[PDB]
Amino acid sequence: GPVAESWCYTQIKVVKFSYMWTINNFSFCREEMGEVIKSSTFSSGANDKLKWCLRVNPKGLDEESKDYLSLYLLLVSCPKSEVRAKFKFSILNAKGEETKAMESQRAYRFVQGKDWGFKKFIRRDFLLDEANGLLPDDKLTLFCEVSVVQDSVNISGQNTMNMVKVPECRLADELGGLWENSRFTDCCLCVAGQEFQAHKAILAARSPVFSAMFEHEMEESKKNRVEINDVEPEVFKEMMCFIYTGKAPNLDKMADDLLAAADKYALERLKVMCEDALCSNLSVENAAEILILADLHSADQLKTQAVDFINYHASDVLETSGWKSMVVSHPHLVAEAYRSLASAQCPFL
Template identity: 50%
Template sequence: MEFNSAPSVVTVPEYWGHTKVKMIRFNYKWTIDDFSFWCKEECKILRSPTFFPDDNEELKWSFLNLEVLETSISIYLELLSGGTSSGVNAECTMSILNEAKGKKKTKILGVHQYIKGSDRGFKNFINKDYLLNVANGFLPKDKLTIFCEMCVKAEVIDISSQPQTQQFKLSAFKLNEDLGKLFDSEKYSDVTIVVGDRSFPVHKAILAGKLKKHRILSTIGYYEQARIDSRSDVFAAMFEHETIESKLNRVTINDIDPEVVIEMLRFIYTGEAPNLDRMADDLLAAADKYALDNLKVMCAKALCAKLSVETAAEILILADLHSIDQLKAQTIRFILTNATDVMETQGWQNMIKMHPHLIAEAFRGLVTKHNKQLDHQKDVHEMI
């Protein structure tokens, strides 16, 4: 028997749980030059350089294996390392790009479990004659470009409540918002940043230190409290010693544009840089000068997202100039993969003139890559 009753009010649960599945999504593009030459040998096997997502370098897990058969081309994805003993669950979409970077041939490799050394893929990804036919547009300038879109299940995160304990987040501690308002209002400032004919009233305590939130357990539950940690060692040293800036309460900046200084100051106050994408290169120089390590990391990620044939040389110069080793290594890998196109750019020509040591580093990487390919080809022939 059913009873109709007024809807009841759901009370705040005494216990609760939340399960989150963390997914890592990333793309990889593999370009093979002179592809028609490789197709002349049946059973020819090519392997791409190792690739992995930015936020999980331990998951160096994938190689694209391309095999030339009698009538078709096979493509496989192989797990090299990382993951758990039970394997890694991943979904992959493979495409061939045309000259306009559009996806011309796409196949979806559904969710599969990969164990170290195992591979999944397509034995007959595309007919070889169809691929080599110039009219079909798969090989612009005789280059085959394979685009791989990956979705990997990284981990399962379980979150549960403390028994009989309420969680409180007090609005009084909206630090980013409050400090942003303080920066905009210019109230209670005690030092002035001067850039050309513009002046920015700011606060020594904010430039030299940052408010950091940490959680406190009290009788009413959890709440957040703030403490001051070091923000910029450069500003801290400037104000803690008998410097001209400390005596005059005035800091003059002659080598950075005013708009970049505003963005840097906003980051110091709020931890955010709204215009990062369009001024990452100039902001990186400012972050390096004033020892803002978190801002340097944000700039490096923004520059990495802009990596292209046209920008590669300029980004490599910036990474070297500001000692960002990870960005430098990733840019060199990109240049090695797209060497022919990159070397035709004006940026590359400028780098030859102004930064020849970077050319030497890039070519050392090219020689190392070539030697590894020769060793692999030798191993394959010995196996056959």
């Protein structure tokens, strides 16, 4: 029993009629072929309008039913224009049980005053033979089953199917909102006279610099009026937002000195991400100052990429004035630049 997404249940409702009909002293039927005996109309609790009746021929309709007692079901009243049904007929024996059952398998279409049935229902000699017991006390008791169908309906029950979804982990932006809200602020950051604000423990969690100079016994003196003199405040806002939020929205316009700030405060993920940002900015002329910044701020992964860049594009790097400034100002970086070029990637001569 596998599980499916959608059930559908198209049922047809059948209503059953129950009816027995007895005739006393039937042997004096008083007529040859041609006479009919219709009983009273009957109905069940199905709109109280489906009126059925039973027609019997004691002798028969015609010459083919000379030795047959004919039996026919007739519909007289119905609200709908067309009603179809399947029907069932039977007689009772001496002891009362069912006898002599025949069936019409089609669901015949019934109209107002339209008949169906078994013309050769039972042999007249077989019925009137008293040894068969088909005429107990000279009484003829019948039984009838009317099975009426009507139009089908649909339910289409879509079962339930979903698991109750959990929301996303909003731990990043929900504490990023705390940056702008500044609720229950513990310290006010000071940079260039302009006043930011922050807490203590959350800053000590992320950075080694703050997790030194918040516990070397300067809580009552430095937390109140903590002073920072190096980083420009527009850089400082973004690196502070990276400490709380964990994201940097506008890194690409300010990717240069944020690496310096990241190396200043030992913020390793910021340093790696600034190396990532300055990796995809290596034009043919500006690699010298990129390598200078990488050397002064210990960006080794960016340093190796810059050295590879100057090795591959050095046919045009040395024409620019940046290389000459590098030669004049920084003697020791040219050692590593020549070293990776010398012991790699062109000793085939």
